[PDB]
C-alpha cells in the first residue's frame, strides 16, 4: 500500500507498457496473446491486444479504457498514451518519494500538459497537402512493399496521394468536400505494372451485358440495382387463347414479355443504363439491349454504392422493380455524365464517367499479379487514411520525434521559470517524452540515447520545422528514429491526437496515485 500500491500502480504502468513498447507501432514486434490460458493470438500494436487482453491491475483496469478511449477517438496515441501513462508515474514515483506531495507537481504536469498545447498552437502545419504525411511517396510507398508497386512506389503514391486529397470524386452521394468518403478505385492486376491509371468516374466491377448490350450509352441515366431482376413462375401470364401449340406456351411466356415493353418503357423512363449489383438474367438482359439499353449486372457493391452515391438522388437500388424491372416509376433515375464500356486491364469494364450530376473517379491500378492488389491494397489504406486525417486536419503536427526534444526543452525552458517544485513538474513531463524516440529506436533496433540526444541538439531557440534541421528540429524516422524532414522522411501528426493522449497520460498517472488503500471490508 501507499507507495507499495502506488508503486504497484506505477509498476503495472511499467509492467504492461513492457508488452507494447516492444509491440509498438509498425516498428513493434508481434506478441502472442493467449485468450484464456489456451488460445493464443499474435500481433504487435498493443492497442488492439490490451482490449482483447484481460487487464489484471486496477491501473491495467484504469488504462485499457483510456487507450480505448484514445482508440475510440483515433488510432494514434492508443498504444502510445499508455507509455507516458507509465512514464510520469515512475518519473513522479520518486518525486513523491522525494519531498513531493502527489498533488504538488501533478497540477504542474497539467500546466506542463498545457505548455505543449501552448506549443501545439505555435507548432502545427495547416498545410497538410503538398508535402504529405509520411510525405507523398513515403506515405503510400511505406505501406507499399516493393514488388510491382515498388518502381511506382513513388509513382503510385502521388497518384493515390493526390487522388484522395482532391480528385474528381463523388463523396457520399456527392458531399462537397475533399474525398472524405475515400475514392472508388481498382487494383486490376494485368497488362503493365506501369499502366495503373486513375480513370474518369467508375470503371465497373460488374458483369457487362452479354446479350449484345450496347457498350456505350452516352450520358447514362442510371438504375443502380442492389435488386436482382431474375424471374418467377407465373402459372398464367398475359393473354389466354390457344390458337397454336405455340399459343399454349405463350401465356406463361408473356410474363417475360411484359418486361420488354416495360424495359422499353424503362428505356423511356428511368435509365439509359441499368446497373445491377444483382444478376440480370440474359433473359432479362435481352429485354434491355434489344431496346438499345446498356444493362449492366452483378456490379460491385462497393462500385455500385459508390456509383449510387455517384449518380445521385433517384436510383433503383431503392425500390425493387420486378419481372426484370417492372416499368420504372422514375424514382430510379441515376446520373452518369457519359458511360463508355472500355476494355481496361485486358478486360472491358463499363467506365462510369464521373456522374451526370456529380464528379466521380475510380483509379485502376494495373499490375501483373494480385501482388499489386495485395500491396497497393494497404498502400491505398495508409495514404487514404493518411489523406483522411490530411483531409479532416489541415493543421497537422510536423515532425515525429523532433517535437519530443523540442517539447522536452520547450518546457525544460519553461521549467526553471516556475522555480521550486513545479519546475520539476515541467521537467519529468519533458523527460517522459523521450520514450517515444526510445521505443521507436528500441523497436527499430536503434538507440535513442544516440537518437533522442541528437534530437535535443537541434535548435536555434526552439521549433520543429522543415526550415533548417541542421539548426532546428523537424521530423523523425522509424527504421532510424532521427529527425528528418516533412517532404523527406520526418514524421507527422495531425493536429488533434496529442491533447487527448496528452491529457490522457496526464490523467493516467494521477488517479491511481490518489488511492493508497486497496483493502477490503
Amino acid at each position: 500500500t501507499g507507495e507499495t500500491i502506488r508503486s504497484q500502480n506505477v509498476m503495472a504502468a511499467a509492467s504492461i507498457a513492457n508488452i507494447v513498447k516492444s509491440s509498438l507501432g509498425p516498428v513493434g514486434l508481434d506478441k502472442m496473446l493467449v485468450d484464456d490460458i489456451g488460445d493464443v493470438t499474435i500481433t504487435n500494436d498493443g492497442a488492439t491486444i490490451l482490449k482483447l487482453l484481460e487487464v489484471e491491475h486496477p491501473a491495467a483496469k484504469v488504462l485499457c479504457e483510456l487507450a480505448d478511449l484514445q482508440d475510440k477517438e483515433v488510432g494514434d496515441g492508443t498504444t502510445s498514451v499508455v507509455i507516458i501513462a507509465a512514464e510520469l508515474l515512475k518519473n513522479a514515483d520518486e518525486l513523491v518519494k522525494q519531498k513531493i506531495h502527489p498533488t504538488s507537481v501533478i497540477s504542474g504536469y497539467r500546466l506542463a500538459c498545457k505548455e505543449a498545447v501552448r506549443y501545439i498552437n505555435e507548432n502545427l502545419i495547416v498545410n497538410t497537402d503538398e508535402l504529405g504525411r509520411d510525405c507523398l511517396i513515403n506515405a503510400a510507398k511505406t505501406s507499399m512493399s516493393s514488388k510491382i508497386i515498388g518502381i511506382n512506389g513513388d509513382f503510385f503514391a502521388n497518384m493515390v496521394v493526390d487522388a484522395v486529397l482532391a480528385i474528381k470524386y463523388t463523396d457520399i452521394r456527392g458531399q462537397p468536400r475533399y474525398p472524405v468518403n475515400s475514392v472508388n478505385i481498382l487494383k486490376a492486376h494485368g497488362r503493365s505494372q506501369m499502366e495503373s491509371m486513375l480513370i474518369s468516374g467508375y470503371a465497373l466491377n460488374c458483369v457487362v451485358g452479354s446479350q449484345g448490350m450496347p457498350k456505350r450509352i452516352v450520358n447514362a441515366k442510371i438504375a443502380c440495382l442492389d435488386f436482382s431482376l431474375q424471374k418467377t413462375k407465373m402459372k398464367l401470364g398475359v393473354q389466354v387463347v390457344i390458337t397454336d401449340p405455340e399459343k399454349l406456351d405463350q401465356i406463361r411466356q408473356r410474363e417475360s414479355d411484359i418486361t420488354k415493353e416495360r424495359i422499353q418503357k424503362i428505356l423511356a423512363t428511368g435509365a439509359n443504363v441499368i446497373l445491377t449489383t444483382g444478376g440480370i438474367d440474359d433473359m432479362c438482359l435481352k429485354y434491355f439491349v434489344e431496346a438499345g439499353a446498356m444493362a449492366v449486372r452483378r456490379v460491385l457493391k462497393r462500385d455500385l454504392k459508390r456509383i449510387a452515391k455517384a449518380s445521385g438522388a433517384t436510383i433503383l437500388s431503392t425500390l425493387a422493380n420486378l419481372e426484370g424491372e417492372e416499368t420504372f416509376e422514375a424514382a430510379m433515375l441515376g446520373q452518369a455524365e457519359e458511360v463508355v464500356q472500355e476494355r481496361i486491364c485486358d478486360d472491358e469494364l463499363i467506365l462510369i464517367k464521373n456522374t451526370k450530376a456529380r464528379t466521380s473517379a475510380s483509379i485502376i491500378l494495373r499490375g501483373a499479379n494480385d501482388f499489386m492488389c495485395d500491396e497497393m491494397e494497404r498502400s491505398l489504406h495508409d495514404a487514404l487514411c493518411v489523406v483522411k486525417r490530411v483531409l479532416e486536419s489541415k493543421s497537422v503536427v510536423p515532425g515525429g520525434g523532433a517535437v519530443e526534444a523540442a517539447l522536452s526543452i520547450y518546457l525544460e525552458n519553461y521549467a526553471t521559470s516556475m522555480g521550486s517544485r513545479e519546475q520539476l513538474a515541467i521537467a519529468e513531463f519533458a523527460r517522459s517524452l523521450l520514450v517515444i524516440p526510445n521505443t521507436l529506436a528500441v523497436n527499430a533496433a536503434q538507440d535513442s540515447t544516440d537518437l533522442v540526444a541528437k534530437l535535443r541538439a537541434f535548435h536555434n531557440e526552439a521549433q520543429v520545422n522543415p526550415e533548417r534541421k541542421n539548426l532546428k528540429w523537424i521530423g523523425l524516422d522509424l527504421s532510424n528514429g532521427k529527425p528528418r524532414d516533412n517532404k523527406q522522411a520526418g514524421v507527422f501528426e495531425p493536429t488533434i491526437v496529442k491533447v487527448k493522449s496528452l491529457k490522457f497520460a496526464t490523467e493516467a498517472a494521477i488517479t491511481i496515485l490518489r488511492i493508497d488503500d486497496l483493502i477490503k471490508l
Binding site: 513492457n18 508488452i19 516492444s22 509491440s23 514486434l29 508481434d30 506478441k31 502472442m32 496473446l33 493467449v34 485468450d35 484464456d36 490460458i37 493464443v40 499474435i42 504487435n44 491486444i49 487482453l53 484481460e54 494485368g190 424471374k231 418467377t232 413462375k233 407465373m234 402459372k235 398464367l236 406463361r252 417475360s256 438474367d281 433473359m283 499479379n369 527499430a444 533496433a445
Partner: protein
C-alpha cells in the same frame, strides 16, 4: 504472460526439440520414435504431424509450431516435419546470438534474402519437367511414395495419380492457376484389386449415391442439378395453406403438380432421365418426375451435385425457367449406376470440358484399396504439385548445399550484420543431410565437409549426400526429385515460421 529473452529462449528452446526427433524419423531410411500414452498406449511413426499430437503440448509457440505444421499439413502434409526442421534450424542459430547481438531485426530481414537467393537458386537448382510425359512425372511419384516405404499397389497408383490429376487439373484465374483437387473423385470399392483401378470421366458419383432408381445407365439423358426451387408451389407460384382437411388436399395438391412439371418440363426442356434434386426437393417433385419416368434422385447432397457440377463440368441452376444442358448436365455426358464390388455407383462422365476423369479405386476390398487411396492421395497431389510446378530439383544435400554458398557468398559480399543470418542460414540446409547422414548412418562432419567440397567445384547442383544411397552423389542420376515449389514450400514455411516466432517476445493471457 511470458517475456522476451525467455520467449526467445523458449523459442530456441522448444523449437529445438520441436524440430528434432522426427528427423530420426525422416528419410526413406528413418528412425521411428516410440510414443507412449500415459495409459500405456504405444505409437510408432515417422509422422511429425502424428508425433505432434500424443505428446503433451504446453509451450504456446509449440502450439504455433503445430499451427504452421498443420498449416503445412493442410498444404502438403509431407515436409511438415521438414518445414519445422529449418525454422528450428533458423531460430536456433541466429536468434540467441543476434538477439544477444540485439535484434530479431537483421535476422528478420536477411531471411527475405535467405528466401530469394534460394528462390533464385531454386529456379537454377530445380529443372523443369514434362507434365506432358507422365513417366517423367512417374519417377517423381515412384520417388514420392517410397520415403514411407509404400510401393506395392502405389506403383500402379503412381500412374493413376498422373492420369486424373492432370485432367482433374483444369483451372484458370486467367493466369491459369490450378489447385483443383475436388474435381478428382476417389472411390472406396470392395473387390477388384489394388492393381486394378482407373479414372473415369466427369466426376463419378460414389459416396452418397447408390440410388438404384437413377435408372442405371444414362446414354444421353441429362443429369439435372437443381438450385431450383423445384419445391411444389401449393398455389400458382406460391405455397398455399397446409392440408388439415379434404378440401385443402384436392385444390392445393393440384397446383403443387403444375409448378413441379412446369419446372420439370423446363427440366424436360433439357431432356433428362436422371434429375438429382437438391434445392426445391418435393415428395411430389420426384413423384412427378417418376411419373414423368424421369428418375429424380433426392435425399442427396449438393456436394454430390458439386461433384456433379464437376461431373458434367456444369453449374447448378436456380433458374426455374428454361432449364438447359449448359445450365445443368453440360455436354452430352453420361450417367451410369455401376456396381464395382456390388456397390451401386453413379458414373457421370464426359464433362463438357475435357480433362475430365475421376479416380476409380479398386483394392481387393475397401481397406487394401484404402492402402492405394491413402498413398495415391499422396501420389495424386504430388502431380498437381508437379502440375503446380513444372520445375524439379536433385534432392538431398544437392538441394541443401547449393544455396548456402551463394548465401555465404552473399554474406561474404553483403558483409553486414545480415551476413550473420546468411551464415546462420548457410548450414541449416545441411541438417536433413545430417539426417540423410543419419539415414545412411554415417559420419556427418565428414560428409558435410565432404559435401561442402562437393559444392566447391561441382557446386552440389545435383550433389548431395543421399543417406539412402549413403553417399555424396549426383541426385539426378540417382534421381532424387521433387517439384521445385515443394522444396520452396518446405523452404518458404520455415523462413516465415522462424520469422514468426522471431517476432514474439511476449506470450500473454
Amino acid at each position: 504472460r511470458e517475456s522476451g529473452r525467455k520467449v526467445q529462449s523458449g523459442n530456441i528452446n522448444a523449437a529445438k526439440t520441436i524440430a528434432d526427433i522426427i528427423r530420426t524419423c525422416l528419410g526413406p531410411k528413418s528412425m521411428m520414435k516410440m510414443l507412449l500414452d500415459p495409459m500405456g498406449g504405444i505409437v510408432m511413426t515417422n509422422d511429425g504431424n502424428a508425433i505432434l499430437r500424443e505428446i503433451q503440448v504446453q509451450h504456446p509457440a509449440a502450439k504455433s509450431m503445430i499451427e504452421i505444421s498443420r498449416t503445412q499439413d493442410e498444404e502438403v502434409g509431407d515436409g511438415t516435419t521438414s518445414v519445422i526442421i529449418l525454422a528450428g534450424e533458423m531460430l536456433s542459430v541466429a536468434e540467441h546470438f543476434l538477439e544477444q547481438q540485439m535484434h530479431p531485426t537483421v535476422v528478420i530481414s536477411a531471411y527475405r534474402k535467405a528466401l530469394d537467393d534460394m528462390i533464385s537458386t531454386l529456379k537454377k537448382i530445380s529443372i523443369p519437367v514434362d507434365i506432358s510425359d507422365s513417366d517423367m512425372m512417374l519417377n517423381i511419384i515412384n520417388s514420392s511414395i517410397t520415403t514411407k516405404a509404400i510401393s506395392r499397389w502405389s506403383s500402379l497408383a503412381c500412374n493413376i495419380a498422373l492420369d486424373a490429376v492432370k485432367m482433374v487439373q483444369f483451372e484458370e484465374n486467367g493466369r491459369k492457376e490450378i489447385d483443383i483437387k475436388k474435381y478428382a473423385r476417389v472411390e472406396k470399392i470392395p473387390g477388384g484389386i489394388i492393381e486394378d483401378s482407373c479414372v473415369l470421366r466427369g466426376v463419378m458419383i460414389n459416396k452418397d449415391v447408390t440410388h438404384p432408381r437413377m435408372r442405371r445407365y444414362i446414354k444421353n439423358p441429362r443429369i439435372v442439378l437443381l438450385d431450383s426451387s423445384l419445391e411444389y408451389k401449393k398455389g400458382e407460384s406460391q405455397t398455399d395453406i397446409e392440408i388439415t382437411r379434404e378440401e385443402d388436399f384436392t385444390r392445393i395438391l393440384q397446383m403443387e403438380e403444375e409448378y413441379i412439371q412446369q419446372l420439370c418440363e423446363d427440366i424436360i426442356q433439357l431432356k433428362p432421365d436422371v434429375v438429382i434434386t437438391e434445392k426445391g426437393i418435393s415428395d411430389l417433385a420426384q413423384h412427378y418426375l417418376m411419373r414423368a419416368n424421369i428418375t429424380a434422385i433426392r435425399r442427396v447432397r449438393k456436394t454430390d451435385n458439386n461433384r456433379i457440377a464437376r461431373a458434367c463440368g456444369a453449374r447448378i441452376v436456380s433458374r426455374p425457367e428454361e432449364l438447359r444442358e449448359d445450365d445443368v448436365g453440360t455436354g452430352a455426358g453420361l450417367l451410369e449406376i455401376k456396381k464395382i464390388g456390388d456397390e451401386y455407383f453413379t458414373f457421370i462422365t464426359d464433362c463438357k470440358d475435357p480433362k475430365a476423369c475421376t479416380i476409380l479405386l479398386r483394392g481387393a476390398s475397401k481397406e487394401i484399396l484404402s492402402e492405394v487411396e491413402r498413398n495415391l492421395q499422396d501420389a495424386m497431389q504430388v502431380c498437381r504439385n508437379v502440375l503446380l510446378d513444372p520445375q524439379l530439383v536433385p534432392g538431398g544435400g544437392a538441394s541443401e548445399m547449393a544455396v548456402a554458398h551463394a548465401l555465404t557468398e552473399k554474406s561474404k559480399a553483403m558483409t553486414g550484420v545480415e551476413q550473420w543470418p546468411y551464415r546462420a542460414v548457410a548450414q541449416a540446409l545441411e541438417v536433413i543431410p545430417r539426417t540423410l547422414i543419419q539415414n545412411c548412418g554415417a559420419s556427418t562432419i565428414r560428409l558435410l565437409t565432404s559435401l561442402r567440397a562437393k559444392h566447391t567445384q561441382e557446386n552440389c547442383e545435383t550433389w548431395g549426400v543421399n543417406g539412402e544411397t549413403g553417399t555424396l552423389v549426383d541426385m539426378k542420376e540417382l534421381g532424387i526429385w521433387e517439384p521445385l515449389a515443394v522444396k520452396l514450400q518446405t523452404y518458404k514455411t520455415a523462413v516465415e515460421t522462424a520469422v514468426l516466432l522471431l517476432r514474439i517476445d511476449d506470450i500473454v493471457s
